[PDB]
Each structure stands twice: as C-alpha cells, then as structure tokens.
Copies of this chain bind each other. A is one copy, B any other.
Amino acid sequence: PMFIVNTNVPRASVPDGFLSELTQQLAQATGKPPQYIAVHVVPDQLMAFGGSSEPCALCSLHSIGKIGGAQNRSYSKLLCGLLAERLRISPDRVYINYYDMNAANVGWNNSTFALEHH
C-alpha cells in the first residue's frame, strides 16, 4: 500500500517517528506486511480547505484490494486520529482519496504485481 499526506503544517511540527508510526499502523489496518507499505509526508504546503489556511491535510491511500465501504471508514478513523494527535489537524479538515488498484496497474521491481499472465 501507498499513503501520502500533503499538509500546510510546518515540517518542524512533524514528530520524530511519524513515518514509522504510519507504516506500522497501516500494516495492521490493511493486513499487508510492513515491508510493502510506502509512506510520503509533505509538509509546508500552500493549501486551503474551505477557503481557510488553518491546518489541513489532503491525502491518498492506494492498495491492491482491501478497499471498500467499511474498511475505508475504518481507515479514515485511524488516519484522521493520527493526523489530529500527531499534527494537530482537525478531522473535518482532512480529505483522504482511496484507490483500489488493480494488480496489473502497480509497477514494482522491474515488473508489476500481475505475474500470472502474458
């Protein structure tokens, strides 16, 4: 899985261990091994949510499967929780785009995750 967070919160406000915490928590939530989880945090961004520049975050979570109604609600509770406690961003100022990726559309290690057909 791949999780990206873009926020106007300053870099100094990102706590040590944050990328590791996201990796570990996402591994647990998705059931995927941590070795396969990638995380990218982008602070100091020029952005607004509802016309306001108060702290906010625009994010995305891509995963091959493990994406759906109930799971996404659960992912959001988890992620909004972490953004609120770690970056002090209010949950109602957080957007998370979820993408259910097809294995053939995810490249890795010189190939893709579609290794069964030619």
Contact = CB atoms under 8 A, between A and B. Distances in A.
> 4 closest Cβ contacts across the A-B interface?
A96-B107, A76-B107, A35-B50, A40-B47
Interface in A72-118: 72-73, 75-77, 79-81, 91-92, 94-101, 104-112, 114, 117-118
B80 A109 contact: yes
Nearest to A111: B73
A104 B19 CA distance: 26
Contacts of A51: 19-20, 23-24, 34-35, 37
Which of A37, A91, A109 is packed against the most chain B CB atoms within 10 Å? A109
Given A97-B101, A107-B94, A48 B69 contact: no
